[PDB]
């Protein structure tokens, strides 16, 4: 039995029943964690209330919320909505509601489910190519949901407006220079296109000053008809090494997870977004506090 004993793994390597006087080093004993330590923000919760009241903007004027130094409950927010689609990259859908981060970014808009295939970077379309693009580096999540009847205060908009052309007219008036959208940035054309596109296929143009390189900025907004209930899209991005504080889930505040008590013995720690195992000691301050 290879894993029974030290001599057993002695024998299973060397592939033999009569291992010579093979004086190994063998596998080591590792310590077991006698406790657990957790620190995080206390008495502050990430505030999703602005997401609840008012008219949600279009995809190309998505509103952004940035949370640092707070406790969050994403399950509560997703309960209040009828979740249609929920897909994550470099993070798992169960993990995004339970991990600790340094900053959480939640971008929300009004999006009709029909163009679900236009939200991935693959299958470019007009949305991911002119309206909204997520960063390829940090872990991301994408949510499609529908507001229920019982939730009254989200004032439904009048139509689903979204960009189809945002392009720059060079001084030659001959060349058309497309304006691709960069990750986590607004499209360059949001300054001219209004919040709601009045008519499917309308056009807008403005003349750029020489400081901006001259030329013309030309854009066009298309429209998809409303739905019975409003459909919205959420994008979540998380960062890790950016703040000295963290965005963590909420725990139960009656535990013995204090550093000063378990001083000198192996412990699990989740001090902030950073976690591991180790042994703590009282020690003279040495870095930047």
């Amino acid at each position: 039995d290879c894993g029974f004993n030290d001599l057993s793994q002695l024998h299973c390597s060397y592939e033999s029943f009569d291992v010579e006087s093979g004086v190994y080093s063998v596998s080591s004993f590792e310590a077991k964690p006698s406790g657990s330590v957790v620190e995080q923000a206390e008495g502050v919760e990430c505030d999703f209330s602005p997401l609840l009241s008012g008219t949600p903007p279009q995809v190309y004027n998505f509103k952004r919320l940035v949370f640092t130094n707070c406790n969050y409950n994403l399950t509560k927010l997703l309960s209040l909505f009828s979740v249609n689609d929920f897909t994550c990259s470099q993070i798992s859908p169960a993990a995004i509601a339970s991990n600790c981060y340094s900053s959480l970014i939640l971008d929300y808009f009004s999006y009709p489910l029909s163009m679900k295939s236009d939200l991935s970077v693959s299958s470019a379309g007009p949305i991911s190519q002119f309206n909204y693009k997520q960063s390829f580096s940090n872990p991301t999540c994408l949510i499609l949901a529908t507001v229920p009847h019982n939730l009254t205060t989200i004032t439904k908009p009048l139509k689903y407006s979204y960009i189809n052309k945002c392009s720059r007219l060079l001084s030659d008036d001959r060349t058309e220079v497309p304006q691709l959208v960069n990750a986590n940035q607004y499209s360059p054309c949001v300054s001219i296109v209004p919040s709601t596109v009045w008519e499917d296929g309308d056009y807008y143009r403005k003349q750029l000053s020489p400081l901006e390189g001259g030329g013309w900025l030309v854009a066009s907004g298309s429209t998809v008809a409303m739905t019975e209930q409003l459909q919205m899209g959420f994008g979540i991005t998380v960062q890790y090494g950016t703040d000295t504080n963290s965005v963590c889930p909420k725990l139960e505040f009656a535990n013995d997870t204090k550093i000063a008590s378990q001083l000198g013995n192996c412990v699990e720690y989740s001090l902030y977004g950073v976690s591991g195992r180790g042994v703590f000691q009282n020690c003279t301050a040495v870095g930047v506090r």
């Epitope: 008495g43 505030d47 209330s49 406790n71 939730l151 009254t152 205060t153």
Partner: nanobody, 128 residues
Framework: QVQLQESGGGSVQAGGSLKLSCSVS????????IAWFRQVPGKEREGLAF????????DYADSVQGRFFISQDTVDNTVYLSMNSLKPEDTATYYC??????????????????????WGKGTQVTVS
């Protein structure tokens, strides 16, 4: 684990003043919001006010704004609801409510409590 209990209900002359109490128990974390509702019989529920606990800030609905006053004892963590100058239209069962989160009560009292998780037994009040 969380228990909400309303008390203090009774009948007073219209144009009087009254005060409820809503004992709250079972919170291990101080980050929550507590709201007051009322239910007129044979109709749908509708909210009146709420208090956000750590911040301490409070808000009221349009209909009873100024007329009502909400507060909370710093040692009992119980919320109140002071009615002044009551009217015949104020006959209903007053409900207490709470939530796991802290930011849902504002949407809640304006959506008849769609977001709440915790409900009290209620307390009927009728004005003569």
């Amino acid at each position: 684990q969380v228990q909400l209990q309303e008390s203090g209900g009774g009948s007073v002359q219209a144009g009087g003043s009254l005060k409820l109490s809503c004992s709250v128990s079972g919170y291990t974390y101080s980050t929550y919001c507590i709201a007051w509702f009322r239910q007129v019989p044979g109709k749908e529920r509708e909210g009146l006010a709420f208090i956000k606990n750590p911040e301490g800030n409070t808000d009221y609905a349009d209909s009873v704004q100024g007329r009502f006053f909400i507060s909370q004892d710093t040692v009992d963590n119980t919320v109140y609801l002071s009615m002044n100058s009551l009217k015949p239209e104020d006959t209903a069962t007053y409900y207490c409510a709470g939530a796991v989160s802290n930011w849902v009560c504002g949407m809640s009292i304006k959506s008849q409590g769609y977001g709440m998780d915790y409900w009290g037994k209620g307390t009927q009040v009728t004005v003569s």
